[PDB]
Write a protein that binds this ligand. Structure first.
Ligand SMILES: Nc1ncnc2c1ncn2[C@@H]1O[C@H](COP(=O)(O)OP(=O)(O)NP(=O)(O)O)[C@@H](O)[C@H]1O
Ligand SMILES: Nc1ncnc2c1ncn2[C@@H]1O[C@H](COP(=O)(O)OP(=O)(O)NP(=O)(O)O)[C@@H](O)[C@H]1O
Ligand SMILES: O=C(C[C@H]1NCCC[C@@H]1O)Cn1cnc2cc(Br)c(Cl)cc2c1=O
Ligand SMILES: O=C(C[C@H]1NCCC[C@@H]1O)Cn1cnc2cc(Br)c(Cl)cc2c1=O
Ligand SMILES: [Mg+2]
Ligand SMILES: [Mg+2]
Lengths: 475, 471
């Protein structure tokens, strides 16, 4: 890799994802080919998430990707893509490609939900969405077409709706921490930063490590009764009284893959968490100029077989006329956690020499212990990636109390955690003065609240503070 | 249901799928909301198939749904949907919404595959696809947008390519036979009916049972070196000599769901195969009822634990008989009644959706029996189905025999010379006397007495082929 992650971040990223066989670049601006190597990780977290939501009793469906002008409105225009022709012929009416599916599902919900006996209704779909973005295209993080999951539910009490929102968030925390080994903070968006139609947005926030900029990784809204008013979704309660449902919607995209890449990669290339990577261990024969290659190769496939059995996603790189060192590089680029060398002396000893991707430390593992050790090592490695990552993160958060402390913190590539009065009016103020001195918005009010002494003034107004809140520059 | 499968077939279907909660009708013509009850079945066969391909080494990926006019129009113009405007602004260039993904993938393959060391390449995606259809829209069977799976691969030899084609087909047979309980015949297509760019097209064909009309369930093509020429997909072989890959593609859609409905449903409503249905058994209490509801949960738990997809319909102010109907409509294979007497005996009364035979099952034997019952039922569905199907195929020998069979609502199996020129004739000649095309030459070939004349030309026959009216 030419560019360096701390010198030339933009170009680094571009390089690791292309060299690491994750994406391919494409002739439509904003759209990128997800390749097997990356796609599989999307499969990994998806199954996890999908199981998770099934346990909660959500069921999947599929609405159509095309929407009508008529239905698409309750008085963003640029971001919509419109289909106008079939071959040469116009359509008598232009149809939008969905940016979201709210305006498609809610009309149906009003029809379907008639009585308390229809609730709850918990649907979700795995679809693609299009949003012609004004902002700059970046692979995974912000693209013009993207895969996501998008869930919409409806309930007889807010209570029940809210509980679900929280469950889905915890599921997102896991998506990220347990599988991507990416640390994230649960919080609750500020009024101007939440979802407009929603009563409340809760969210998990990441911090691109070197940059010092926060980023939204997934959302989970309590929609309250608001869309229920709009699309007139009513139900007869136990009593007989017509009433409005309480609703939630939530979502998380292939952006997750992008955060995960940036969270772990280094100048040698990608570094992928073993829980979701495609090949966890790649066995590589080292053979000399002289003969005897066949035995080495043999013991490689034997060891492969033994590991497969033990559960390990193994793979032997046997490519002929292609020197081992070259291979070492190919797979390091691609982020494979363990490399397993086998040369003449490893055969005669009865071992493989095991090189770890994140730290580059080698170790001899006897074939006899491989099927316990290798699993052991990956499981170490996954927690390590999370833990190193979790700390860089923890580091990047300064707990302040006055406005004076902000621009120093900011200029150290840090984010701040400060007492706040939470008046929405202050948000655009704070954005502006910070840019004045690039801007810094509220990122989220975290659930894990450090203690708030009676007295505590808001850092920006002096008014009594309500709650700690994260502020910082963003993406 | 008002309509009847035998009498007003089109209205019936529309009825069963709406009253059965599979789809919902939608203001864009040709596009229907797949509802949970139907969607789950798509999940069922999809996992099957996905696991199947994975065992064959096929990894999934995602290409984009938008294509350049440049790329697309290399090489049914009315079928393409074009995006032209973002908000109000015309894009510099219009972009097509994919109908298939061949023009998006085969370029990348040309780039990616360079050395014998890059083969085989086996990719697949689970995506949606839009084709603006001239022909009339029908739920699942032919729609404008549809979910499908589409697989593309590239190999050093035809040998290896072909093998995979056949593997994928066998997976499709199972897709249909083992999970949907729909019978299908494997076979190879004729030239005018195969895929244009394909060397050979193999296929599983169904027969909508009443209709007398055949239908394509899934395709699996040997592309050969065709597209490799077109897109210059080349590789330096073991010996150092630049060469063209051999390729395959294959695909199967939410149409499968539609055949499945047509193949089992009756005038009471939907009748769904227990291996894929959402709820296999719905317990229903009958009250004149605290104990009753209690036993219903107790039995629900027991069955859940036995592997069975249970659900208890407990809805207050909603009389049992009503419920019986709701669930019959929705296709649930087993209805488990529990009224006062069933509680006092320690049993549930178990009613089959397909036949309506009732049976008493004691709770003590339930966790053995119910699985046993469903597993029976699934086979019974395939077996009636397969029987109707076998019955619809008359093995003829001359043109004389054809119009009778066709008018009998049947399909025919006749020896053929396989000359492509005859296909168009046969279509006309029959459409005259609506038409009849060659559906597929089946893999399982009845024997060919030396001397056998072609039923249409008197030329020597190559092989038995299926012919009949279609969809
Ligand atoms: N274009 C995109 N590409 C990839 N992921 C996206 C994209 N837009 C949004 N997301 C992610 O999906 C989550 C839910 O989307 P949503 O909250 O509806 O977007 P939004 O409100 O438009 N935020 P933003 O797109 O940044 O203006 C966001 O929090 C992002 O993590
Ligand atoms: N519009 C559609 N909606 C749903 N499934 C379809 C549709 N068109 C085709 N399929 C299914 O997908 C399989 C592969 O499609 P394909 O090979 O493109 O056929 P085709 O060229 O579209 N033939 P035809 O459907 O008569 O136009 C078909 O054999 C059908 O089983
Ligand atoms: O998409 C949303 C809110 C929620 N929709 C369901 C998935 C989870 C998500 O938080 C906000 N949003 C974002 N982008 C949009 C782009 C267009 Br174009 C339109 Cl019409 C509408 C929207 C729009 O409503
Ligand atoms: O879709 C095919 C060939 C194969 N593609 C992958 C899935 C399985 C399928 O048999 C044939 N086909 C069908 N319909 C098409 C419609 C349009 Br519009 C275009 Cl451009 C091209 C096509 C086109 O190539
Ligand atoms: Mg946006
Ligand atoms: Mg077609």
């Amino acid at each position: 890799v030419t560019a360096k992650k701390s010198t030339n971040f933009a170009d680094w990223y571009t390089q690791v994802i292309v060299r690491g066989e994750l994406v391919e670049y494409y002739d439509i601006s904003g759209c990128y080919i997800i390749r097997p190597w990356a796609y599989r990780i999307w499969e990994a977290v998806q199954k996890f998430f999908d199981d998770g939501i099934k346990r909660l009793g959500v069921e999947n469906c599929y609405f159509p990707m095309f929407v009508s002008q008529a239905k698409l409105e309750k008085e963003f225009k640029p971001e919509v893509a419109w289909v106008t022709h079939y071959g040469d012929s116009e359509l008598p009416e232009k149809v939008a490609i969905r940016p979201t599916s709210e305006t498609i599902m809610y009309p149906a919900y009003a029809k379907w939900i008639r009585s308390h006996r229809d609730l709850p209704l918990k649907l979700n779909q795995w679809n693609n969405v299009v949003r012609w973005e004004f902002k700059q295209p970046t692979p995974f993080l912000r693209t013009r077409e993207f895969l996501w999951q998008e869930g919409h539910t409806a309930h007889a009490t807010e209570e029940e709706a809210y509980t679900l929102v929280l469950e889905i968030l915890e599921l997102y925390r896991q998506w990220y921490e347990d599988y991507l080994a990416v640390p994230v903070i649960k919080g609750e968006k500020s009024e101007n930063e939440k979802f407009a139609g929603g009563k409340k947005t809760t969210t998990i926030e990441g911090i691109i490590p070197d940059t010092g900029r926060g980023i939204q990784a997934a959302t989970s809204h309590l929609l309250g009764q608001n869309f229920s008013r709009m699309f007139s979704i009513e139900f007869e309660d136990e009593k007989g009284a017509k009433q409005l449902v309480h609703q939630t919607s939530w979502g998380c995209t292939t952006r997750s893959l992008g955060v995960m890449i940036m969270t772990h990669g280094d100048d040698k290339g990608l570094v992928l968490p073993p829980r979701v990577v495609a090949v966890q261990a790649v066995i590589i024969p080292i053979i000399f100029k002289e003969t005897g290659g066949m035995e080495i190769v043999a013991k490689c496939r034997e060891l492969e077989r033994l590991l497969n059995a033990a559960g390990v996603r193994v793979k032997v790189d046997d490519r002929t006329n292609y020197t081992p060192g070259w291979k070492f590089n190919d797979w390091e680029l691609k982020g494979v956690p363990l490399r397993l060398e086998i040369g003449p002396r490893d055969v005669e000893s009865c071992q493989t020499r095991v090189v770890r991707r994140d730290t580059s430390e080698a170790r001899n593992v006897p074939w006899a212990e491989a099927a316990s050790t290798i699993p052991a090592m990956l499981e170490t490695m996954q927690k390590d990636l999370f833990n190193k990552a979790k700390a860089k993160f923890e580091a990047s958060i300064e707990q302040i109390t006055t406005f004076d402390e902000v621009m120093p913190a900011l200029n150290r590539r840090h984010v701040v955690l400060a007492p706040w009065c939470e008046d929405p009016e202050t948000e655009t103020q704070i954005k502006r003065e910070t840019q004045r001195l690039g801007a810094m918005k509220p990122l989220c009010i975290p659930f894990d609240q450090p203690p708030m002494p009676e007295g505590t003034r808001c850092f920006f107004t002096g008014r009594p503070a309500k709650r700690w809140c994260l502020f910082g520059r963003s993406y």
